[model samples]
Target: GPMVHITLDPDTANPWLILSEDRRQVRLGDTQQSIPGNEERFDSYPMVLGAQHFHSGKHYWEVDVTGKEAWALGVCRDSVRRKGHFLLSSKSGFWTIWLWNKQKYEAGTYPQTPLHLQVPPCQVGIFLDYEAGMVSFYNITDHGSLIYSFSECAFTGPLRPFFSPGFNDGGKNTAPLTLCPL
Candidate 1:
């Protein structure tokens, strides 16, 4: 397997996100957030991505998770709420992105409530480049729509943090399936 590295410029405004050493968790930086009512509303976390200040807007970034088998990736607005938006392409076999979003998740899950996204299972590739001024999903093989997309979404906080190298049937699928340049 080959190592896929993503590089970000120092001056970029978009929040930077990465996975933890265990790869089961995510880390976001250069982030901001706001909710219904709160004075001086600003906070940060070391490992957990928040949904307080992150907004919905167009962004440009790249992900390189090639060679990975049975993986998933997407964004999360609130740790409790999930709104599925897969950045990577679907697996050649599976058609569904699975339960990418949920109004409220079971206990022990991340986030309290808002909006979250999840990638479907059996996906082989990852989203390589995103710069359409909007978040959209594409079926690379057929160039079809995996599901409805958000034209102008406003993320509450912690703009963008993704998950990859998903596992199924006790198998580790942490391989580089895609890559995009800065």
Candidate 2:
């Protein structure tokens, strides 16, 4: 697979991934600023943080963030008001996956247990663990070893609806899951 390159301007809008015209490669945003008025066509699955909500199958998918400044992939509800049920996020040169019972709508970071994984600033990887109560991350190219593990990981709802770009954490966009792709 060809790696997609997206340059995000923190002063501008958050950049994300979407299917190419051929649906083969994921492409970066072409416009200069944030997604250009939030067009719906840009809404694709694996709806990373700061993206739109869409339905997803109950299966584990992989997100390869080999060479991006920051990237996050998780599950969420279909509605904007609902909270993100689960997620694996990376920012500030660190990567961690959080397993929460509910979403917090406050002004500070909530307490979460860390999975033992240390990812470099700019590297490629994927997250794939869909079995009940089992969450893990894997390096795509090497298949070297399991990076981290969150045992007994199970989402809350039979109706797994979600939304992302979650409520602000200290005015920073702590984009959580709202929905994902099929």
Candidate 3:
């Protein structure tokens, strides 16, 4: 696997997301801060995109989701909608796995599939093979165990890494989503 360095893009982050000064981490704000409306900002989710876009070849990155009760991480087409509610699925240009309600882990597919694992991972590694049309997720905290994968994807455009620490849920899931270096 080849490592790809990336930082969070604050310009595309949700208003309630607090991005670190280094742009490597993002957390949900306890209160929504007033931010000027922008076409790039996500309006319905606490999400952000990587500053770098992947157009070809293999790319990999990891995220530290420790202590987060809920989160979503993966890749999305550059044209993915930044406003309103949208389904986080391959059909919608999103290949993601999410942990929700503190215990449920799911693959964001058209029908939304549940991922059954004996133990949950605190860190996740994502691998994308643009030419091969494959996206895979691994439980890095669990000895690089395979989590889920989206195969035969028709990647039509450049893709950017996507992330969400999920909603605050009254501070239950306020941990920062930190991008990890390989």
Candidate 4:
């Protein structure tokens, strides 16, 4: 596995999102503090991008979602719209697998592909092959079993790691999404 070190991009983070000082972890918070509106800022989504962007080659990263109830993880185009309320899918330059309400797992597609895992994956491994035009998600906690994949991707531009720690859920889902050490 060729895992790259990933750090959260603060500039693209929403006002309600919080990034660790070291930039590895991102957590949803209660305070909706003010942040300068920027071209890369996500206004409608509680999400953030990784500091490093990829144009080619294969890359991998693991995110520890140990205690969180909900989260969205994968990769997205660098030029994807920032201020919008829309579903994240391949049509919108996103390839992701997400968990909702700690009840179901789904692929970020038009009609989401539901994942019926016997047990939730506490840690997820994302594999991105830019040249191959594929992105795959794995259940790291389940013997590296595959979860879902987006293939035949027409990567339009630089791709950055995407993350949404979901809502704070009144503090029930405040745990940070940790970029595990490779």
lDDT of each: 0.29, 0.31, 0.90, 0.90
Deviation (Å) of 174 in candidate 1: 4.2
Cα lDDT for residue 29, candidate 1: 31
TM-score, model 4 to reference: 0.96
Q: Candidate 1 regions off by >4 Å?
A: 1-56, 62-68, 78-134, 141-154, 172-174, 177-179
TM of each candidate vs. truth: 0.35, 0.39, 0.96, 0.96
RMSD of 4: 1.2
Candidate 4 lDDT (Cα, 0 to 1): 0.90
Candidate 3 Cα misplacement greater than 4 A, ranges: none
lDDT of 4 by residue, 24-101 (tens): 998898888688998889998789999998989999999999977899999999988899788898888899989988
Regions of model 4 farther than 4 Å from truth: none
What is the clash count of model 3?
0
Minimum summed lDDT over a 10-residue window in model 1 is located at 100-109
Superposed Cα RMSD, model 3: 1.1
**Candidate 3 lDDT, 37-92, residue by residue in tens:** 88888888889999988999999999999977899999999999888988998899
In model 3, what lDDT does residue 109 have?
A: 92
